[PDB]
């Protein structure tokens, strides 16, 4: 997860012999590994333009992360005092989780040196002017290499409190109103007092079948804040978006349909998932007026096809689902969650009551943006047939089931 530190050393600018290494843990680690400080001594203690900046450079097989600090005050010799708490890491890693820690260590020691002159007085030599470093470096090194955390008191009111956090990818901006959210975790037990009130309102409505517009209307929430809360839950890797379930939808098998076969726990979970708890009444309705085997579920998952809607597929295969007591919504949801089937979206491209002015405006804007039937149906709060009738009234259109 987190790369161990290779060598920590504290370099200071002596007013007589220039830049030099004061303390270094492990002892003689840089000379044993062929790291020569005089090669990059002008980056460790650079000019004040480069100072107070997170400087990271590559030296051979090692990456050297430092936060140079220069304090200008007439108390010091040569009117300035410069130091650097320098961290050495291997090159083939990610030093991104460690950079805020080193930056805050440098800034905190800058504050302490500006306040009580800690590091300058710790040298015990009155040539820099007009608590142990080595023990602190040992403690920082072993606590960050053994616990990814440290609490090292350096004074009666000062301590080094560093916790290394992982870096997470930002959430996408592709989340929209027609997407339904699927909570991968039990969100009721994560709720503590520090949660946003909007997210706390959204939580009891993420049931895997509610659209973001439906969740916004159910929770009396503005859809933008719901979009941002779903984005924040995406950022913590707990909500995955999906599609509104309709029988007018078109589902087709994906390239991962063989993962129904090459997985020890997908088919058994499908058996325990897609089946009604009892002999449901849907398994008694005619078409017009033991658990199911894994082979039956696979044969039902293959039989989906492009251009064939779920109404046609279900009316072609309804004795199979009735005899095996299979919930078609649960079947489709399990197929989409394991990424073994995908939805072919319907696109009404161009070449009944009187529709309102704002309604016709958003319909025209949705048509000129080549939006799906799902987004238009969400925006007008209408089923697919009313949208199709209004579009046929407005012009001639063709549907792409991509």
């Amino acid at each position: 997860g987190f790369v161990p530190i290779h060598t920590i050393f504290y370099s200071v600018f002596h007013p007589t012999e220039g830049s030099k290494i004061k303390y270094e843990f492990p002892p003689n680690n840089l000379k044993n590994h062929g790291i020569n400080f005089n090669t990059f001594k002008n980056y460790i203690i650079p000019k004040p333009i480069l100072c107070h900046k997170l400087i990271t450079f590559k030296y051979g097989t090692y990456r050297i992360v430092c936060y140079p600090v220069t304090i200008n005050s007439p108390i010091y010799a040569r009117n300035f005092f410069s130091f650097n708490f320098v961290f050495v890491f291997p090159y083939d890693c990610e030093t991104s989780p460690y950079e805020p820690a080193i930056t805050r260590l440098g800034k905190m020691f800058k504050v302490l040196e500006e306040q009580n002159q800690l590091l300058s007085k710790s040298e015990r030599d009155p040539v820099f002017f007009d608590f142990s470093i080595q023990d602190l470096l040992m403690r920082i090194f072993q606590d960050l290499n053994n616990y990814s955390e440290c609490l090292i008191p350096i004074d009666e009111g000062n301590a080094v409190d560093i916790k290394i956090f992982p870096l997470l990818r930002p959430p996408t901006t592709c989340v929209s109103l027609e997407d339904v959210p699927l909570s991968s975790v039990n969100l009721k037990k994560i709720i503590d007092v520090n949660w946003d009130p909007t997210m706390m309102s959204i939580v009891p409505y993420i049931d895997g079948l509610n659209s973001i517009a439906k969740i916004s209307k159910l929770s009396n929430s503005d859809p933008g804040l719901v979009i941002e809360c779903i984005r924040h839950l995406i950022y913590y890797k707990c909500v995955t978006l999906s599609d509104i379930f309709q029988f007018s939808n078109i589902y087709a098998p994906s390239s991962l349909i063989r993962n129904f076969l090459t997985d020890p726990l997908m088919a058994s979970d499908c058996q325990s998932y897609v089946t009604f708890p009892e002999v449901s009444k849907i398994s008694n309705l005619p078409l017009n007026k033991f658990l199911p085997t894994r082979s039956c579920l696979f044969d039902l998952y293959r039989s989906l096809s492009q251009g064939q809607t779920l109404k046609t597929w279900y009316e072609s295969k309804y004795m199979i689902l009735k005899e095996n007591n299979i919930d078609i919504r649960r079947f489709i949801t399990f197929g989409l969650e394991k990424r073994i089937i995908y939805r072919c979206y319907s696109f009404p491209v161009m070449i009944m009551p009187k529709l309102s002015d704002e309604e016709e405006g958003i319909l025209e804007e949705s048509i000129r943006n080549a939006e799906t039937f799902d987004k238009i149906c969400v925006l007008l709060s209408k089923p697919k047939l009313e949208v199709e009738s209004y579009l046929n009234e407005l012009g001639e259109f063709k549907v792409i089931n991509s």
Binding site: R104, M108, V111, Q115, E156, G157, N158, K163, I164, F165, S183, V185, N186, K189, I190, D192, V193, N194, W195, D196, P197, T198, M199, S201, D207, G208, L209, S211, K214, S219, N220, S221, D222, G224, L225, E228, C229, H232, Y236, C238, F247, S248, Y273, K281, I282, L285, P286, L287, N288, K289, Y314, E315, I328, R329, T333, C377, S381, K382, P383, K384
Partner: protein
């Protein structure tokens, strides 16, 4: 209007006192006293010097200026304006005259005040002198030749300009860089909570907030007094925080207050930061390690979360120190600004009745609660308060008086702690509730009908402003509406805080004025004794308005006041028509004048019992244990002043007092040049200095225009019965504070000084003033201090109230309980009936005398031997002292001796190592035993 080309010339201040002077002979079309634009321009924006629009007032030359200057059309005084112009001599500039001034009145003229005390009435008087006067940027103004001021911003029509014009409607804003600032650190469970970047929020507070604010204070060279106090709510129940309902506060809780740094100047920022860091590291051991009576300590207790914390209790703790307008004067600092540092995001669960009381209290006093949040800005409007009504109904409201700041590409603005910290193990937050089981309709007989019915229904379904829901946003005009009305006319708030603005453009409506208001009327008139002095109705009127501005009234000018006056000219400064409108949250005053001299004052007067009693635990700077507070922070308030007696006494007395300050002069070292003045005793030259100070006070007596055409040693009762019914120990005198006539009003103060003196007894000077300018009092005190220090004395400023009463007034002040280790009345090593009969507090008096503590209350009855002269009284009233007060010879600390032998001890923060020395001496067996042994040795021998 033509543009008038002109040359340039400079002159020294010895020839003229104006800023920009023209020639009225050379410009006959320009009348004197008119706003005249000055610009060096050739109808082009020539870089930066080509756009220099400077206003001034058309004033003619003098006789010496006309005799000397010949080739210069414009004579401009050298200094700041010459540096701003940046032009050489005889340069070609242009002059334009604007006959209209009201269209060119600047919206905002800022004014920065340093190192001095200026009341709001003094700001009103200073703005009265700035009517029809043109100012420019960074101009160092003056007031009574001692109050400087830098104009750091001029605004007009939403644009910042280098120079502007100050008119009647110019909303001039006074800000102070010498101000009292209170920081309330809200120690909760979230102070140790990590931010998404990886920093604990107290690390932000002590490494990014306080060093930066101290650096910014030093960079502007502000001279503040900081006051930092922790603020802890402790949850005493074992219920989990996840089970807490949103809106309801904690039922079982204990509230703590650790004052880290008292009223300390910000030049000691190193010591301030050191104390803050040490006390924050020690607060966990102080609170979470409770003491059990079985002889050991148990690690118990939990900090409350930010949302359920005691926020309104913290704000009322802050507003304790402003309840009394007539408190002790900080003569070097002006504004009281409170900053609350919180690790939350502006969301607080509060009680409804306490929220109402907090709003009513904050609308009646001069504080701006600037909440700063160390977490990121959330998705809702801040600050957000959630409360439950009497019917258990959730509500959301945004308070007007709280301003929220945040201390700092996609940023995570919603906090999920259990997923950021990975606090829930992966096997135990697996999803339990899934997609539903496709229930039927009990109206469907076919599978095709079920599919059709599913596809048909697949897409179906005045101190706060009440937010309908935090999840829906507000309009731009609504977010523009969120600002307090009493502060409607205003980084700059952090560094240079603003006083309460002199004017308000708001008023209750006509239906509200007749709904919840009662009417009281005054009729106050000049008295013939005060017109012997230079006192008409006008200066008495502005003195009454000065008192109203001191209490917190703002002079209403605007539209609603004009539209409610005509339903019977509004004024802001001071003819015979002086119709002002002064308003606080409690009462509104309409004041009108006439040529007869009668001032008509109409008072439109407008919850505390439905809030439970709340006595927190307060730890001051010098205490070691948490003790019960001496004041209820919620139930103390700004009381409605008895304004009738106030107007009666400014015209010319139980439960009434004005501004007041007791003064103690003390014997100190004698300068070497004083010893060369007949060789005299040091006691003789000190009593000579005391007599000279008394004579200097009696030579400062305020005189009418008609007329301008005992020492001893020992206890007091021994001297009373030695020279042997009411015996006055002080004299009455009404002095003139300002003899040079800098101000345009009467500055009269009442002086009481001690009739009798001991070198071992403190000498007392009293100053009782109502409407005097405090800077004149301060320079009078400086003159008296110089006179005392020339003769080897030391005038020092001391609290008027007793030391035992300061935890019941000012909770931030240091105050400690002293329990001496060696009890003479209990330990048999030092015990005697005759000694305790002759001197009951002999050992305590000798302990105080050996540590350098002079005595304060000479008339005390706890160190007495006999009683005579049945009534004793000072000239300022009876001595209402409970214990025997003692003053340090340096005057930094005050001591007090009780009847049970326990001492009080508190520093003199008004004037401001030895305090810790005396506390360690009182709490050491060896040192106290040695001092008592020396006392017994002196008693025997």
């Amino acid at each position: 209007i033509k543009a008038y080309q002109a040359e340039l010339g400079y002159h020294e201040s010895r020839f003229s006192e104006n800023l920009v002077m023209l020639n009225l002979v050379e410009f006959p079309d320009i009348k004197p006293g008119d706003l005249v634009e000055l610009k060096t321009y050739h109808k082009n924006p020539s870089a930066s010097n080509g756009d220099k629009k400077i206003y001034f007032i058309a004033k003619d030359f003098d006789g010496e200026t006309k005799r000397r200057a010949k080739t210069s059309n414009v004579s401009i005084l050298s200094g700041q304006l010459q540096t701003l112009l940046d032009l050489p001599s005889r340069s070609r500039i242009w002059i334009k005259l604007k006959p209209n001034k009201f269209d060119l009145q600047a919206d905002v003229v800022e004014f920065n005040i340093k190192d001095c005390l200026l009341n709001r009435g003094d700001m009103w008087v200073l703005s009265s002198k700035l009517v029809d006067t043109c100012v420019f940027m960074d101009q160092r103004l003056a007031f009574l030749d001692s109050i400087r001021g830098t104009i750091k911003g001029i605004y007009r029509n939403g644009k910042k300009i280098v120079s502007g014009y100050i008119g009647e409607q110019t909303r001039i804003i006074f800000r102070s860089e010498s101000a009292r600032l209170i920081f309330l650190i809200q120690i909760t469970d979230e102070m140790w909570n990590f931010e998404e970047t990886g920093e604990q929020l107290f690390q932000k507070m002590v490494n990014s907030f306080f060093p930066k604010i101290f650096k910014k204070w030093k960079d502007v060279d502000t001279h503040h007094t900081i006051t930092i106090a922790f603020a802890i709510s402790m949850d005493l129940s074992d219920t989990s925080f996840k089970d807490l309902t949103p809106g309801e506060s904690l039922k079982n809780s204990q509230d703590y207050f650790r004052i880290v740094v008292d009223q300390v100047s910000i030049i000691h920022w190193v010591d301030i930061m050191e104390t803050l860091r040490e006390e924050f590291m020690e607060i966990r051991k102080d609170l979470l390690n409770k003491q059990t009576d079985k002889g050991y300590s148990v690690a118990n207790g939990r900090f409350s979360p930010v949302i359920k914390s005691n926020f309104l209790e913290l704000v009322n703790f802050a507003t304790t120190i402003l309840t009394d307008p007539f408190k002790q004067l900080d003569l070097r600092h002006t504004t009281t600004h409170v900053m609350i540092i919180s690790p939350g995001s502006g969301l607080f669960d509060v009680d409804y009745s306490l929220l109402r009381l907090t709003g009513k209290k904050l609308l009646s006093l001069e504080m701006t609660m600037d909440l700063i949040c160390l977490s990121k800005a959330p998705l809702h409007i801040v600050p957000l308060f959630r409360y439950r009504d009497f019917e258990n109904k959730l509500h959301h409201c945004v308070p007007l008086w709280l301003s929220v700041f945040f201390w700092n590409e996609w940023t995570p603005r919603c906090k999920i702690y259990d997923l950021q910290m990975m606090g829930i193990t992966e096997n135990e937050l697996i999803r339990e509730v899934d997609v539903e089981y496709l229930q039927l309709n009990k109206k469907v007989k076919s599978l095709s009908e079920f599919m059709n019915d599913y596809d048909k229904n697949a897409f179906e379904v005045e101190t706060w402003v009440d937010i309908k829901s935090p999840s829906i946003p507000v309009s731009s005009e609504f977010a523009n509406e969120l600002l307090p009305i009493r502060w409607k006319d205003v980084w700059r708030s952090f560094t240079t805080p603003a006083e309460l603005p002199i004017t308000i453009s708001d008023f209750p409506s006509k239906d509200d004025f007749d709904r919840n208001f009662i009417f009281r009327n005054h009729s106050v008139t000049l008295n013939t004794d005060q017109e012997q002095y230079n006192q008409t109705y006008k200066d008495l009127l502005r003195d009454m308005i000065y008192m109203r501005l001191l209490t917190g009234f703002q002079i209403c000018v605007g539209r609603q006041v004009e539209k409610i006056e005509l339903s019977r000219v509004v004024n802001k400064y001071l003819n015979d028509a002086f119709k002002l409108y002064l308003m606080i949250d409690s009462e509104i005053h309409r004041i009108t004048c006439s040529s007869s001299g009668i001032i008509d004052v109409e008072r439109y007067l407008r919850l505390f019992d439905q809030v439970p009693s709340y006595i927190p635990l307060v730890k001051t700077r010098y205490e070691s244990s948490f003790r019960d507070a001496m004041i209820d922070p919620l139930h103390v308030k700004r009381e409605s002043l008895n304004w009738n007696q106030i107007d009666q006494v400014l015209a010319g007395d139980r439960k009434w007092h004005g501004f007041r300050a007791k003064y103690v002069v003390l014997p100190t070292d004698i300068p070497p040049n004083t010893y060369s003045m007949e060789t005299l005793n040091p006691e003789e030259i000190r009593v000579e200095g005391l007599r000279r100070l008394i004579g200097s006070i009696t030579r400062s007596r305020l005189r009418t225009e008609k007329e301008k055409k005992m020492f001893y040693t020992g206890p007091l009762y021994n001297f009373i019965n030695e020279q042997q019914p009411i015996l006055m120990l002080s004299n009455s005198l009404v002095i003139d504070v300002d003899p040079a006539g800098k101000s345009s009003k009467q500055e009269s103060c009442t002086v009481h000084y001690d009739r009798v003196h001991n070198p071992d007894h403190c000498f007392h000077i009293r100053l009782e003033w109502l409407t005097t300018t405090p800077k004149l009092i301060d320079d009078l005190v400086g003159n008296w201090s110089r006179l005392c220090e020339r003769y080897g004395l030391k005038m020092i400023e001391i609290p008027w109230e007793e030391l035992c009463t300061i935890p019941s007034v000012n909770p931030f002040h240091s105050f400690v309980e002293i329990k001496l280790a060696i009890n003479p009345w209990e330990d048999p090593e030092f015990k005697d009936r005759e000694l305790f009969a002759k001197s009951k507090f002999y050992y305590h008096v000798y302990l105080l005398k050996a540590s350098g503590f002079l005595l304060d209350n000479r008339a005390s009855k706890f160190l007495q031997n006999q009683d005579i002269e049945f009534d004793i009284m000072y000239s300022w009233g009876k001595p209402q002292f409970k214990y025997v007060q003692y003053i340090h010879h340096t005057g930094a600390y005050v001591a007090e001796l009780r009847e049970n032998g326990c001492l009080f001890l508190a520093p003199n923060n008004i004037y401001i190592k030895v305090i810790l020395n005396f506390k360690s001496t009182c709490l050491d067996y060896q040192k106290l035993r040695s001092i008592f042994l020396d006392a017994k040795e002196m008693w025997i021998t």
